[PDB]
């Protein structure tokens, strides 16, 4: 997903190639950038 480009599958299990993530219970700057105001604010003329 970063800079990787092999089409075939890894020879090693995922549990050996990477650490495994656990859960408890572009996220913020993406939401922030999408919420930007892109309008006008006056009355427009022509």
């Amino acid at each position: 997903s970063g800079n990787t480009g092999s089409i075939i599958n890894n020879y090693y299990m995922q549990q050996y190639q990477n650490s495994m993530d656990t859960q408890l219970g572009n996220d913020w700057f993406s939401k922030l950038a999408s919420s930007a105001f892109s309008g006008l604010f006056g009355a427009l003329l022509a």
């Binding site: 990787t4 549990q15 993530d21 572009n26 996220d27 950038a33 930007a36």
Partner: protein, 220 residues
């Protein structure tokens, strides 16, 4: 018999950028949970669009002050991510690690004078090929916008990408004496008692701004 193979010359050396992964040696490790941490960012240009940072004007200050004299140029600089005026913005800090860009760069102008200080300003984009305009009047023929002060303190303007080629260089070549991508020209049309008040200006990436071709070139 066994499977025959040609070990090929010219392949196999380590490349610092290659698209493959190393063999693992220490399996089964489970991490502390980190789902939902605040403040993640995935793409450096989401923060370049959402967070404008300050321009730098003569004196090392992020603002320009209204002048009271016949000269109406408040600032004029190269539309270049290597411009001195852009050199402390996050956008310039990002741009040094790529060789090409295109798309919009937005400038933000915020008036800081008291309630009884008023002014009217003009920003113009002057494309390469002619000397930049020295007066509001010569500059009126450029793409430009004019605005005045009031209840809203800020005005934002998109500098357009206009070029013969589809991408431009983020660095400036030592051969290039005239700036290859033109100038931005900020003028003061007039003011009513705004002497000494500061207009502070920031820059951020526009919606279609794009950086491509990562490069590492010493620089910091």
């Amino acid at each position: 018999g066994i499977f025959p193979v040609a070990c090929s010359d010219g392949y196999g050396g380590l490349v610092t950028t290659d698209p493959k992964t190393a063999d693992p040696v220490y399996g089964k490790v489970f991490n502390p949970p980190r789902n939902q941490l605040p403040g993640r960012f995935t793409n450096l240009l989401d923060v370049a669009e959402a967070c404008p940072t300050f321009l730098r004007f003569e004196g090392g200050v992020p603002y320009v002050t209204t002048k009271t004299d016949s000269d109406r140029v408040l600032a004029q600089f190269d539309m270049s991510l290597a411009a001195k005026h852009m050199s402390n913005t996050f956008l310039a800090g990002l741009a040094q690690y790529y060789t090409q860009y295109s798309g919009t760069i937005n400038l933000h102008f915020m008036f800081t004078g008291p309630t009884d200080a008023k002014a009217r300003y003009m920003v113009a984009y002057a494309p390469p090929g002619m000397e930049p305009p020295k007066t509001p009047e010569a500059a009126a023929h450029c793409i430009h916008a004019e605005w005045d002060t009031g209840l809203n303190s800020k005005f934002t303007f998109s500098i357009p990408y206009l070029s013969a080629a589809d991408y431009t260089y983020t660095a400036s070549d030592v051969a290039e004496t005239t700036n290859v991508q033109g100038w931005v020209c900020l003028f003061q049309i007039t003011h009513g008692k705004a002497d000494g008040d500061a207009l502070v200006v920031l820059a951020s990436a526009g919606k279609d701004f794009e950086l491509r071709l990562p490069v590492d070139a010493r620089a910091e």
